[PDB]
Amino acid sequence: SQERKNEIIKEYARHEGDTGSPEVQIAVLTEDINQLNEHARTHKKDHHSYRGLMKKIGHRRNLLAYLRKTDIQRYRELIQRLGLR
């Protein structure tokens, strides 16, 4: 949903008008991942959709790895805000 996506983008924007940035991308990915996890539990046999979920998870992992390498403090803040490990 674009409206939900936009609200998350505004919430986690590094600064005004910042659509693209580790925080924004990771947060948006996390919400998609949670929503898609619910879809998967509803449709255990939706293997094709599950593949896209795995790709999102991998992309979110890569963004987290980059962010931790770049600014560890921003990494800590983001994981706390999103409740990640």
Give whichever of 15 and 73 is closer to RNA, judged by the CB atom. 15
Q: Give the residue ranges of DSSP H helices in 1-85.
A: 2-12, 22-42, 47-70, 72-82
- The distance of closest approach from Cβ of residue 10 to RNA in the complex, given in angstroms and rounded to an integer, is 11
Sign of the torsion angle spanned by Cα atoms 57, 70, 83, 5: negative
- The distance of closest approach from Cβ of residue 77 to RNA in the complex, given in angstroms and rounded to an integer, is 15
Distance separating alpha carbons of residues 54 and 72, to the nearest angstrom:
25
The residues that touch RNA, with contacts defined as CB under 7 A, are 2, 5-6, 9, 14-15, 17-22, 24-25, 28, 32-33, 35-37, 39, 42-59, 61-63, 66, 69-70, 84-85
Both tokens assigned to 64 = 């987290």
- The distance of closest approach from Cβ of residue 81 to RNA in the complex, given in angstroms and rounded to an integer, is 15
